[PDB]
Symmetry: D2
């Protein structure tokens, strides 16, 4: 288990990192990146803290004590302990302002190490070379868990030699890849990328690449969005953007070389249709737990806000609060149903039921903007104009503000801090990224919908139609089509 | 365990029953009532059928084999077996067209027999009489379970000597009551009523009555709604109303006498504030399971319908189906979360978590009309005009209809039967009662909302605000009010 | 202008009419059909009543006084007078329980007589016959306006020699047609059908037929839905179904002969793509006015209901009422905007703007089920069980009901009549037809949507994009595509 | 009519202006304020430009040519010309990024000068002084129209000697006022404030003040929100925040003296219940026109966006676009209905119908967040990470981005500029203010609702209930209450 200091030092490795178009010399000291770097460094230090040993750490097969970000669950009870672990972090990061510490990112590997053989068995390699992909996965896992490396996935591809990342040479030492990966999170703050693909029509063999790639590999450029961090603002004014900003970005691979040992699979487009989705299941699980915590945070803020404003006895307000409570409890119920109806993989991994995970996500995705909008409605104008700290500190007018903007049972400053917490999260570029990330994180709503009806449980001849068929007195599609055809043959038309 | 025949015979007992204003001589033979009578009679016969022993029956403490409608759950596994039992019935009754067989009605007693003593301890009796209410409950339970009586609750009161039911004499033999109970289900088809109150402002001591009352007691008149049963229609035309109609009604008590042994509590308005709600918890549980089955039936019909019509490949249709699937899985998830987070009462009853039960109900109540509306949207005109059986049987035009209205892979008749199943349930008076019952059954949505915010978990100083307070750096209400007051005292304004 | 008596007599003409599969001897006397027949007969008598001359009648070009159901508007003021005329009828028929008296049906001809020549010019006839279609339209108009015939359109076709209506012989006297028209309204209560097509992929020349066809033509069978009329019920119990039922149906043409003079166009599928839509514009106009009146009726009932129940001072109830008011005023505003931005055809017809007409329809179609649902929510249980007249007339219990169910300021009977008016319209088969008709009347919502984006005003290069382009500093599609291509040509990729 | 230069110079007047807590020396040069100052200066210069004389200017009673921001409409045609004028400005300011140039602010005076006498007649003054308030209004109007002063209203009060603004001395020269006005727009960029009140329970005589007050009056401090202007950003990156930011703020009056001639009314709380609402009617009119233009801008951007991305042929996307079109046309229809059903005041002012104005606002207020959310849904990830100009200008990676992020028929840069225009407006603090202003501008949705039901047209005994009463056969409230009472008196209960 690494220290914060070891984590910070590992980021000073000559990586090429662009933020808003500026090349960042040192991610641990530059104002644009340093707060988030420090927040992950603290993340590592807490794991080492004895007080949090029970919830944060475990003893692995090899007998070594490791962080729960490396814990593969093998029972319902294990899954519940993982849930508690994800909650610890969503709580420690204030409802989940940072969605992708190692705990959220590493879960993408869990399906690979559970079932490595297909990654090799399905591979398509050139020139008769034979690579032990499955072995690669096992030893990858042994290294990253032992050394406590930080990894972030990049699986999404640019729409559209294509500009998409693709193999341009294979040789005895490994492969060379050129082009873009379209999006990834926390890129400047990890040691290695997990690159991969999710199948899209037209994808070629050379575009199918799954591999670990160090962030400071020659020819790799991280092109990140501008930072919305505000390290010099006053924390009263900007309580969250002062902490840091979890940057997202694209990455360009300029003839980047990857050694065979770092490759997990290449060459087979159809591999990319089934197996990455099983990896993204684990992200969805983590995300969906975050949803519920965010909804908890929202209803909490709303309770404090309407109480502070005197409106929580209005029956309309009560009624809307009740629906915020219901929004929270819906997300929580899907999380419970998912865990409770999970099952073990062939490899012995205990996996929450993705049906409840994805439909819980869908519930969040559909309604979240309504829950945020409702929280803002409760604020009134206090959100348009809420004084800065400098305004309250003015020698003459400041005491006048404290007088003018106070409530019966809460000071002006405390009450305005509720508005500012709501403004920061839902009415700033800083906060807007959070909401936008949650919207387009893995499978979005419109695709959850279309994938739902592709599932076997929900086909016309599947079991969800049994009750209806029984009520109508119908066989299956085939039986019904048979009667129809016979009615045609027994008439003339 | 009684037979269908014994059940039918028990209904021929001189009860005074009005249906649409007509006095019904014999509920087992009158066209208005007889189909439903027969459906409950079959209900009783199935319990006696060896094939369904595992799911329908159990062996009680006393060593006797009884129907699961009398089974008190004492573990999560017991609760799950009850769930399976309620599902059997919702399935046997076609998604749940009849909401109140004994299995759905009897659950109201479960909280009474679990915790009888308060019913006595809280009572307020006149003239120094002392009645063993708790003993009454225990022996009531012993009689109704042994003899397999059918019971239906009447707890709702007329709005407003009031016209509400109230005690007008107490004597050594028992009590006399006069006035109305406002609503109850299956009244003509049970042996005894469970009368009670749910607290309302202004309720007096004399208006607080909980008691078992035989349906053929002198002076008791059952005033039921008109029957929508259609025993003479063709089943192809009206597949459900031909079975029967589960009537609802009011009841007038004209100086009805009730013996002490049948009384469970009188006299204490505040008793009516806490204890009936614990009874209605068990109805809500049963109801909420039905919700999920109804949503299953709806999505099933929609799948068959859009398949039969050729529209299930339209992306919009796919998208709407997916939301019907999500409506089903939401209800199912609340049911699972409720069971999974249940707990045992002091008496040892294992009770699903009412938070997930009520919020699951709320989810159903809010959206059901949208799910029905969407199912109808899928039908198109086929719902405006769909031929009768007589139209298809016409010697010349009928074969022409079979030709005109057929689909690629389904005959005209089969396809029109899908429309007619949808019309019967959602576009007839017969079916409208179902929907209206589900809407105003126990706690309706607007009240679930207001009760939610009265719960302790969801108060401003309760734990749902902890995360928010921690993010804001706030103590509790008291701590915050303290700072405010001090800021007032440390200034001049 | 015909009398009610002349109208009734004209229905006794040997027409072959099936209702629920029963062959109806005489539509003016059969219980299933006679109430509606009588309601249209009264419709005709009111036009002749001097008291309503100003709003109901006009003096035509030929100098004769005729019913406004024959009035072609030539100015905005004319359109407003037509609006007042449609309102008279929607009001006289209680919010619009009957959607298709002559006033609503005849509007389909207005576009034909405004612009007849294309109907001929576009025609495709066999064997060198030449038919004066345009002349046919003019003389059709002269006969039906002079003799005051009642006409109903049948334009919708069965999905799928096809079973669809199609020409099977042409000869010097006229045409012969065989097959079905799929749906039409008031069929048993009109003198002649206006048959036509709306284009569908695959439609052949022989399937393109526009023609007037008398209802008692040899070989024509009207196959109507069952009647939901209740001529023998008590009006207190069923206030609307006692009046009658406006039946809908299909029609089978068994080698029906149509003389050339009755033919308006045959043979050209592409004619059916543009010209019937201009006819349906006028129905949509009429319908959309009805929408607004129905919404008026709904908010009215809701006001009376919540007042009668004591709930209209609840802020939540107030809030919902306000949204019912807004639903009404939205429909009204689209009707005003449509009239106000109308324009004259080439023929001199003043036509409301179909953009506001269709988008107003869409607003109604999307939300109506929510407005009805909200009205029902206001009723509570009173809708599940509301006494019949026979229940209130019982010598002993009836006075007890009047006592139990009364309100502070409204009797039991009056208040229950509000429930029953709501039940009749929204919770009976009788009423369900109304709602279903409004749903699938002409262009339904999903098609309004898709047609909206096909309009020229709303194309990507159309004027609705001008403001956006100006903000972005963009030319048109072509200009932008040009820059892109040049950026490709000025690089190497 | 003033020049831009004269307008700028007038802002250099020793006003005390706080922005984010910094005291601004000179509003025309400080980076925080100067862009907006320049935008209003251009506003003034355009009025003087001959090319825009027809739409921007008019010739007043006195024979002088003045800006339409001073034009009182006296006919429907005048109102339509005002509408065109407000549109010019919403278009010139890119859908309406700045909501409060003089054209939007000055409309608040229109009702005062139309009907001045009550302002005097209702006044309550101390010590027998008599002030010619009505004369004051007339001469105020003559000065501000002749000199072309810029005025902004401050009517909103702090919730709660109160901290609210109130009179603390009256004398022969005028009044002295102390305390806060809670919110106002464009404060640093106008010459004078129009201060007033909207009635709230408990308001005293001394808290009722309507008056013109110069912005640089001794003792007046403008306390504005922080600027979100970004004068040094690249316009490609931030196309709107580079222009400027229309600041909002509070104002503190430290014993500010106001001469009688500047006072329009004092002393009468009940005056504040009726007359300010007639002033805010004109703001609502202006706002509601802006709504429609904003919705035009949204649908425009959506069309360009989905076209640029290739998604505008997806039926789901088509369907959502259609609903954006319908959102626009709804707002437009309410604006047309409002103008079309307007009427002249007693003073001869032609005033749009506030029923359609407010209900159109309500439609916007309820759905706008859904329309914005839908526009963002169309963007996908492109909104999470979209390159800066510096990223595209990088010598090596920049051409690679232009390659990777281009579309078939649009360059990378152009397409990303669509995302950035959407991000700027809906996902920045800069843009969030716009949305928040529109939300809490004048009467918000929850209050439109409650005020709707207070209107006379919508009372239970008003005309919206006539149709319902006629269907039920009911008199008015009184008639019904009479029958009920008689039914009570003619029985015994």
């Amino acid at each position: 288990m690494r220290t914060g200091q070891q984590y910070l030092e590992s980021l000073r490795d000559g990586r090429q990192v662009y933020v808003g178009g500026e090349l960042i010399d040192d991610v641990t000291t530059h104002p644009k990146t340093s707060g988030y770097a420090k927040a992950i460094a603290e993340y590592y230090d807490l794991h080492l803290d004895p007080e949090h040993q029970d919830v944060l750490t475990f003893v692995d097969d090899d007998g070594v004590r490791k962080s729960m970000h490396w814990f593969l669950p093998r029972s319902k009870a294990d899954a519940a302990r993982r849930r508690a672990y994800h909650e610890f972090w969503f709580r420690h990061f204030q409802g989940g302002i940072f969605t992708r510490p190692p705990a959220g990112m590493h879960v993408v590997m869990y399906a690979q190490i559970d079932d490595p053989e297909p990654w090799g068995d399905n591979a398509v390699v050139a020139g008769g070379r034979t690579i032990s992909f499955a072995d690669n996965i096992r030893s990858q896992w042994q290294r990253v868990t032992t050394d406590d490396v930080a990894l972030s996935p990049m699986f999404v591809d640019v729409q559209f030699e294509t500009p998409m990342l693709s193999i341009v040479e294979q040789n005895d030492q490994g492969i060379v890849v050129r082009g873009w990966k379209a999006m990834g999170t926390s890129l400047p703050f990890v040691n290695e990328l997990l690159v991969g693909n999710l199948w899209r029509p037209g994808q070629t063999s050379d575009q199918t690449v799954y591999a670990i790639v160090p962030v400071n590999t020659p020819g790799l450029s991280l092109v990140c969005r501008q930072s919305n961090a505000t390290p010099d603002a006053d924390p009263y004014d900007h309580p969250l953007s002062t902490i840091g900003d979890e940057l997202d970005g694209m990455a360009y691979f300029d003839d980047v070389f990857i050694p065979w040992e770092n490759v997990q699979h290449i060459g087979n487009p159809d591999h990319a249709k089934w197996y990455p989705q099983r990896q993204f299941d684990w992200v969805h699980i983590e995300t969906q737990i975050r949803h519920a915590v965010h909804a908890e945070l929202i209803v909490g803020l709303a309770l404090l806000l309407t109480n502070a404003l005197g409106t929580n006895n209005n029956p309309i307000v009560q009624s809307q609060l009740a629906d915020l409570v219901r929004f929270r409890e819906t997300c929580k119920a899907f999380a419970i149903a998912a865990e409770e109806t999970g099952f073990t993989t062939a490899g012995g991994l205990f996996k929450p039921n993705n049906i409840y995970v994805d439909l819980g996500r869908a519930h969040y995705l559909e309604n979240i903007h309504n829950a945020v909008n409702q929280l803002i409605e409760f604020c009134g104008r206090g959100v348009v104009m809420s004084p800065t700290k400098a305004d309250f500190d003015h020698p003459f007018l400041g005491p006048k503000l404290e007088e003018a903007l106070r409530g019966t049972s809460i000071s002006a400053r405390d009450r305005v801090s509720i508005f500012r917490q709501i403004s920061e999260r839902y009415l700033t570029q800083w906060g807007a990224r959070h909401e936008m990330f949650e919207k387009f994180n893995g499978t979005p709503l419109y695709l959850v919908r279309l994938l739902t009806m592709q599932r076997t449980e929900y086909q016309v001849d599947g079991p969800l139609t049994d009750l209806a068929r029984q009520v109508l007195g119908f066989g299956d599609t085939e039986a019904l089509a048979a009667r129809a055809a016979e009615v045609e043959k027994n008439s003339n038309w």
